[PDB]
């Protein structure tokens, strides 16, 4: 939930 | 995992993982090559660099578990790539919040062929 940095 | 690390960002910034760091510089998200274009783009690099460290460990889907003792960030004991992977997420997250104030929208989808130059870890 909500990231791929 | 990225599940920790994207909750992570967001309770230290205020700002979603995704978009405004997946895509941010020439380090933050996919990718690593060229110049950090800011300090906020340097803590991307540095994270890069920090996983880089752990090559025998899977950075986004092994999963940790962290805690917060009263604002601090707390990996808690799991296995070794686990602690390994929670310390260089907390700097980075804690990086993050150091550079708010220079973060940049026009840093934002930074297009590829802008990003020149090699820079060892
Ligand atoms: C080899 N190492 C590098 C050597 C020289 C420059 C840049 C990099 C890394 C650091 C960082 C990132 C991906 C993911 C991983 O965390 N690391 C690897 C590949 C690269 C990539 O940018």
Redesign the pocket.
Do not use: R, V
């Given at each position: 939930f909500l990231s791929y940095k | 995992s990225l599940l920790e690390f994207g909750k992570m960002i967001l309770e230290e910034t205020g700002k979603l993982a995704i978009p405004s760091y997946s895509s941010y510089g020439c380090?933050c998200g996919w990718?690593?090559?060229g110049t950090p274009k800011d300090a906020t783009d340097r803590c991307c690099?540095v994270?890069?660099?920090?996983?880089?460290n752990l090559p025998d460990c899977n950075?986004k889907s092994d999963r940790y578990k962290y805690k917060r003792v009263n604002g601090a960030i707390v990996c808690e004991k799991g296995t070794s790539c686990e602690n390994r992977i929670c310390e260089c997420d907390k700097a980075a997250a804690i990086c993050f919040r150091q550079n708010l104030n220079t973060y940049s929208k026009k840093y934002m989808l930074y297009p590829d062929f802008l990003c020149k130059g090699?820079?060892?870890?």
């Open positions: - | 380090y990718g690593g090559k690099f994270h890069d660099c920090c996983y880089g950075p090699e820079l060892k870890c």
